[PDB]
Amino acid sequence: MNIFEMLRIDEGLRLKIYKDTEGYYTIGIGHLLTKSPSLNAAKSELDKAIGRNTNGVITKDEAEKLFNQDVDAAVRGILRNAKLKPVYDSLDAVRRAALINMVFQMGETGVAGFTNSLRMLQQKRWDEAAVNLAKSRWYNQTPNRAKRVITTIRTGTWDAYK
């Protein structure tokens, strides 16, 4: 198990524009296209992202290309972030995957915001951090995915995904 396979399980793969849980236009592996209510604004963005006139549909390769870009941007965002970097440095490899997952889903700014949990993560107070992370909209909105991430964080194993 690795971060790619972990995210692919969590986000799925869709070759046609779709709406996410929040209602936003998305494509491939959890790639947010736009927060705009317009399918046309989403088709525009998608065409810009792919470099071709897609008509709202892409290939698996295209989707994988986007995914590769997003994991990288996720990683670089963490390392560039003053609040995130130190948490990530302090973690083992499994737990790092978990933070990358959060970041990929909710943005760097989003995660950087979880001040109290970041502090518990750094002090390696696993159980407590798990309890605090569940007290969020994230968990309430996408509970099954959130539980998997929180379990990876608490345990440091890949059980939840096995």
Least distance CB 87 / Cl ion (angstroms): 24
Phi–psi pair at 65, nearest 5 degrees:
-65, -45
The pair of three-digit structure tokens given for residue 104, joined into one six-digit string: 């990929």
Annotated catalytic, 11? Answer: yes
Nearest residue to 95 (alpha-carbon basis) of 71, 136, 129: 129
Asked about 20 being catalytic, the answer comes back as yes
Q: Which is nearer to Cl ion, 73 or 79 (CB)?
A: 73
Q: Which is nearer to Cl ion, 106 or 128 (CB)?
A: 106
Residue 37 is classified by DSSP as S
Instruction: Classify the phi-psi angles of 34: left when phi > 0, otherwise alpha if psi is within -120 to 50, otherwise beta.
Output: beta
Residues that bind Cl ion (CB under 5 A): 49, 142, 144-145
- 95 vs 145 by CB, closer to Cl ion: 145
Catalytic residue (choose from 20, 47, 64, 128): 20
**Binding site listing for substrate:** 32, 104, 117, 132
Instruction: List residues with catalytic annotation.
Output: 11, 20
